[PDB]
Amino acid sequence: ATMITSNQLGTITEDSGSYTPGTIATATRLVLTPRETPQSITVVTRQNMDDFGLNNIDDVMRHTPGITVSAYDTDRNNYYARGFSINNFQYDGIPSTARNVGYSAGNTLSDMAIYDRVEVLKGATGLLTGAGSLGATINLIRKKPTHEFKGHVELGAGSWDNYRSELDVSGPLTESGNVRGRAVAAYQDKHSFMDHYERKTSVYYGILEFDLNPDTMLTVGADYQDNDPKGSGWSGSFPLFDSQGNRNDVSRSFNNGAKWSSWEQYTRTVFANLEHNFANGWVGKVQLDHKINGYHAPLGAIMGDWPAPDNSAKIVAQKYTGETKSNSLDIYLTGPFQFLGREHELVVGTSASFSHWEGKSYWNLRNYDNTTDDFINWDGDIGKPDWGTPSQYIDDKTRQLGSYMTARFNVTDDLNLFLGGRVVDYRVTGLNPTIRESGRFIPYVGAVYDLNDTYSVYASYTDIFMPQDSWYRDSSNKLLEPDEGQNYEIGIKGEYLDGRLNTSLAYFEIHEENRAEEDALYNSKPTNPAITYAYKGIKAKTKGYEAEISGELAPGWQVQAGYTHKIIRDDSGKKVSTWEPQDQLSLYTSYKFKGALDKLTVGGGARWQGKSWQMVYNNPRSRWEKFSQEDYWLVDLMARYQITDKLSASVNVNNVFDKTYYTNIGFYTSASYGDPRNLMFSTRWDF
């Protein structure tokens, strides 16, 4: 018929083995091609994740172009987006409130085995997502059930006793098709080059659809991922400084962690939602959502200038437990709007979210000896001390509301205007100095002009803010106004062949307001409660350019790659985010062969980042020290052979040259090495 392989969220990727995307509504909730989208965008398709064996999300952020994957500890990584740290995840267009990573749970790792694509929206997301963070907003998208039947089961084992396996099954459940359903689940247990670390995750998910015509699908389902790591290290992989001695040298596989230390993060969620097709040529969607992010973290690790002369080092132990539920109501109407001349479109919409995070933390240990026989050569084996009584409780509930409305006017059959905004109110009624904000306006303004039938240009003023935590207060005792910012963008995009190939390069400049910087002088802290410690709020500026291609480079030649020049400093200040390389080159590509051996595909890619540095502190000598990560040229090859019409055979080797490099260097004075040469064989479906 009208060839509906697309949808509300936008044309799917589990088909067109083309690394380039189809239509993303992730920006204005209004379906649009990339070119028709006036904000910087970069998306990892499914045929891409597949080719390179990008199993968990991390394995995507590493391969996403423009983003930098830095680490904290074994089970915690951070994503760098345009000078800032990405901290906004949007599942099927829905944001999440597992905001704080100190008590991280679920976000930094989601087995892809269930999504069709992960669309990252660079710039200022505020329009759709409420309070959030500058940089980018990740946006996973689940697998929606297939009309005709389809499914598969994949196995596969990689290095360090890395074994995994999923199973995808979808189709109709009644002749007519009034009802369609899909179920998928995967299992993965792997160790690591690092000693005693052996995490195992598992994910189940079931989604279904209920037709009735314009009484369009009352689709519903629920997913659940469970990460139970053991031997989890914490903050870095090893302490940068020994007792007082200079630097510390240690195997690529040392692990400050405790054999028993682990950071179990789990997330289960349920959604329900029915879309409706109105006759005016308009459609309105309504969705409910119940999700929960819990965390079971009984950490145990050795930290702090510790390889002491007598070869022994003390170790901090601490336990953190917590779950955090959330309900979300999001309804929206989006369709053709006649004003004059020709039809335009609006997308009136309002949302609501009721979260509730409660949790404990134990660090008032009892009857414990945290000293260790010897440092060097150690398999993080120490007693799992008895955590006394919770030493800090947590009972906070946030009620973020807000309504929005976006306009896609077109003065000319080339130039279209984007007027619109999202107002909002934030309420975090909890156990600490109650705070809330309301009536703040987040604006959305952009326009695209169609030059040749090919290239086109856009400009944009995206915005976003974030009511800050209570920790942050100023000289007096006021929580520095919310951390806000706007992304000033201008670039030109270009598509070729209905949308098989797609290019774009733009100039983005971000301006940060009230950035939370630790007040300095303030040691001679005068009486007032804000006493002890207080931060100040100073302005920051982030400017840079970005360019990346993606799509059908030839006949069956897929390629996606990008380069990004970034620089960020604070009011006539220094360079902040010195770890996120000022320049980065990402290039990934696969080619299927012609006739001769058209039963074989080959691919590979490479990333590059210029000098990376951090500013630590050598307590033992008080003298501050610099640390730089020379250069980065990482390459990885892949290959896959379709031996039978139904049954694939492939193999990826992720760090060809085995580049001994650093992933983090200035975290609480630690460091973590980099996945040395990976290797993973796989086999596709059937029997």
Binding site: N100, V101, G102, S235, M303, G304, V316, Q318, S361, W363, Q392, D469, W471, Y668
Partner: peptide, 8 residues
């Protein structure tokens, strides 16, 4: 940042 208490 975020709030509390690894060694201090």
């Amino acid at each position: 940042x975020r709030x509390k208490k690894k060694t201090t």
